[PDB]
């Protein structure tokens, strides 16, 4: 039962808001894993997406990449944004998404290179899953990644690619477009 090594080492974080903490101070690293076995153990020992309280978020990023815009690997990037519908199981969405990422089940090496991490954000008004990518202008690769996400997550609604600049300038509470859409 020698462990199965992953293409990358990943770190798993919880975002928990408390009063008078800066945004990044609300993040805490709860695991770093590098094997299939340890990947599944993290999920078995942390809260399921369907059980999480609103506004408490899950971040899974390649270990060398901090889960914030300020990281060199994120600052010129963007995210595929997925708006969860009432009929969808967020446990399925999150598990399929993370399997796609940690298993590196992309057609090409180049797509894997774009990947920074994934984010689950439970919200009252509609939950969101995101995949953060290192660039905002590798159109062809960004689009094949978006297409693969939709396939694996069995998504029907349009997904949106939003560069970090647009994320920064987004107002909390505004009701959704992207540089790319599919």
């Amino acid at each position: 039962e020698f462990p199965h090594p992953l293409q990358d080492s990943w770190s798993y974080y919880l975002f928990q808001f408390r009063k008078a903490l800066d945004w990044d101070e609300c993040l805490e690293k709860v695991a770093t894993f590098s094997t299939i076995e340890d990947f599944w153990s993290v999920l078995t020992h942390t809260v399921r997406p369907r059980e999480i309280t609103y506004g408490k978020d899950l971040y899974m990023f390649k270990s060398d990449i901090m889960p914030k815009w300020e990281d060199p690997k994120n600052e010129n990037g963007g995210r595929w944004l997925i708006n969860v519908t009432a009929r969808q199981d967020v446990d399925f969405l999150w598990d399929e998404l993370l399997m796609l990422l940690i298993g590196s089940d992309w057609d090409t090496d180049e797509e894997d290179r774009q990947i920074c991490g994934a984010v689950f954000q439970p919200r009252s008004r509609g939950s969101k899953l995101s995949v953060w990518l290192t660039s905002d202008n590798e159109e062809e690769t960004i689009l094949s990644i978006g297409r693969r996400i939709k396939e694996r997550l069995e998504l029907e609604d349009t997904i949106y690619f939003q560069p970090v600049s647009d994320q920064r300038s987004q107002t909390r509470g505004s009701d959704c477009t992207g540089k790319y859409e599919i």
């Binding site: 992953l6 293409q7 299939i36 076995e37 599944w40 399997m99 796609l100 298993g103 089940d105």
Partner: peptide
């Protein structure tokens, strides 16, 4: 060589 695992295999490990 990029290390690749499909969902069938990952789930079998789960």
């Amino acid at each position: 060589g990029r290390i690749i695992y499909d969902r069938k295999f990952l789930m079998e490990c789960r």
